[PDB]
RNA sequence: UGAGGAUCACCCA
RNA sequence: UGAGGAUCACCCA
RNA sequence: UGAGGAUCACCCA
RNA sequence: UGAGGAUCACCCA
């Protein structure tokens, strides 16, 4: 059994899906990657460690590039324009039972839900008004 | 219009569903609470700041309460017994246009979806493995 | 295959049954815990090394909590109110073979099956004698 | 009671099966070896002492021989080439009932029964994937 | 895909062919090993790292046992006289597409590939003359 | 014999294969290099060494280059943009048969077999999962 | 290595 | 800890 | 020796 | 910046 599997990232109907499949596991930080040049690459990253006695906290970690070509010199090599760069962290007490956890991941999946206020302001480039 | 609503952070079919309701938009920090106690209260906060030159940085919050009850000298009063923090931030550059935008918003629902690695390993007190 | 597979840890005949599932893998410890709050879980770890240049040691780890209800500050929370502890230390040398090392685990299933002398000083608070 | 008796440690189904027997009662630590050259034979030995003012520890050791191309009888060195080690501790808190050690025994027969992973990791010369 | 599956290391066309099944996967480091004793089986294991800001590196190790006049589950000292010992880098370019990287894999083919100078070298216990 | 021959390093099917020819054996290391400008040549090398008493150690690399055509000071020189470097050693003890060497070479061309997990990661960015 | 300890992937000698 | 920064498992207070 | 690094017959620890 | 902490728009390096 493995949960450390490739999933899509970026469900764009069944074509010109994001995927990102495992690269590395080390120091207990794993890693996910797209395909083709790791310089054009989507990655994810992901951790758990005991930040206290009663809290366990994840640490994910999100890179979307914006995919373009560098000339330099007549020279082009495939390259990010730049990258936007999600960073969350999400503390846990020792106390929550399975239950509890899931309704921390609905929580979630909830503030990012189309519609919702704050997907639709990242969406189109605002604040809160 | 607005943006500025209330809005269901946990959907629980259509009962039980927390919904979370505008309070205060102090200092460019907009605020949403639910119903009730506010010791018991599930909360978000959202604010964009250009973070740089070139970047435009989003920090979004939320607090999931273990709603309970504390007994003290016979005198009782609703409390949360503990919260887990939820504490993200988006940097995205200037040059991102909405089509952009919309992108990262994907690739933020994509690694929450039900069944990826990442919610799962959360709603069941796990890792990655 | 993948031998990291949930199963169960305590039989109680169909009923009441621990099992016990895989829940982490980070840094080289594979991870096994009960369904249950972090704070009341059974947990079960297990890690292979070259400990030397002519063996191989695997060190296990069982954790069986007495689960609990504690009142703190006026809150209830599930706790554990106490833990047993097993540590095993298995050193095979390299030049055991498949079947030498099912000899192992026999002799390990032998050593712990109902009715034998170890097995039924423990469960009664015994020595031997 | 009195369980310091023989008992079957490797059940190979009647025909080949490897009986261990009281051999040493030194100190305590009851000492059981199979009908053997000490270099060749099988040995276990238990002991429990209060290791602390709340827990009482049982320290069990068994040494399995390296069967395959083994020449009975014969000397064979290094010593370490040819010989396995296993060491468990037990740790149990003073309150544990006989109950609350019937569990525990359970848990030790659960972790190494057939077909679980721990078991099938070391008889295949594996560790976990 | 889920390439973490068993292969043939050696061919032998269908007769005595070498298989290699996964063994291990502790720290994202995937090892196989064939079904012998640690001390005589056939060994591969492989990483991906990103080894600097412009490079990413798998590191391929393979362990192949001196078969000629080997006793099959014996002890054979020194461990040195009895393994060959193979360890590839593969640094590529971060630049590197899916079809960089398949040419790549092309010239590791074409190199090792029957009749060519190195694999004829190796072969025959030479060097180039 | 002279094992010192061209192959085919690369065999896109009889058209743009790239073969490597001999091209220096200076300081006994026997080199070669494909048809090209130095700057662009994809290059390969082998050397064989007593390296201890008891064993013999093979280096082998091979540079595969990205070629470009840069503009330096107005001017257009052939250019590699890239190169991606493998760095094998093999180490075979002095008792090893020519038999044990054939046995060596076939288990590293079935390790880079097309289908087979490792070439399958590397020609997909990926890491074996 | 220890019939050393633990609050158990930590500490001791 | 931080609506602290980042070129993102770095760095600052 | 190193799942140390490289601009790759060089450098590091 | 930090797989730095938090009682979470605080605090640390």
Chains 1, 2, 3, 4, 5, 6 share one sequence.
Do not use: H
């Amino acid at each position: 059994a493995s949960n450390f599997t490739q999933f899509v990232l970026v469900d764009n109907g069944g074509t010109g899906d994001v995927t990102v499949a495992p690269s590395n596991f080390a120091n207990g930080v794993a890693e996910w990657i797209s395909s083709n040049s790791r310089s054009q690459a989507y990655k994810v990253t992901c951790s758990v460690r005991q930040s206290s006695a009663q809290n366990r906290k994840y640490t994910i970690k999100v890179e979307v590039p914006k995919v373009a070509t560098q000339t330099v010199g007549g020279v082009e090599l495939p390259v990010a324009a730049w990258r936007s760069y999600l960073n969350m962290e999400l503390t846990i007490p020792i106390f929550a039972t399975n239950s509890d956890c899931e309704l921390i991941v609905k929580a979630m999946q909830g503030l990012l839900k189309d519609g919702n206020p704050i997907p639709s302001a990242i969406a189109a480039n605002s604040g809160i008004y």
